[PDB]
């Protein structure tokens, strides 16, 4: 009974993850990277930012409280 994240790049690309609140956001690396590449969002460089404030694969997106009503945004370094 996982939620849906939704995420969005530079305002360019906008999305949404089932994933949950209790991964730590690596397994949401996995999932955008694989909607849209290694070259576009790769799980290395795959930040998020939720509230201001950066969120990396070994945080718990529970720590951010990234809520489907909410979006984080998904930058990666270029």
């Known amino acids: 009974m996982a939620v849906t ?9 906008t999305f949404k993850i089932r994933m949950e609140p209790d991964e730590t956001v690596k397994v949401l690396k996995e999932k955008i990277e694989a909607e849209k590449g290694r070259d ?19 945080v718990p997106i529970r720590d951010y409280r990234i809520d489907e009503k909410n979006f984080v945004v998904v930058m990666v370094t270029k």
Request: aromatic fraction near 8%; proline fraction near 4%.
């Open 5 to 13: 994240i939704t995420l969005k790049t530079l305002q360019q690309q």
């Open 40 to 58: 576009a969002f790769p799980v290395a460089g795959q930040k998020l930012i939720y509230a201001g404030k950066i969120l990396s694969d070994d």
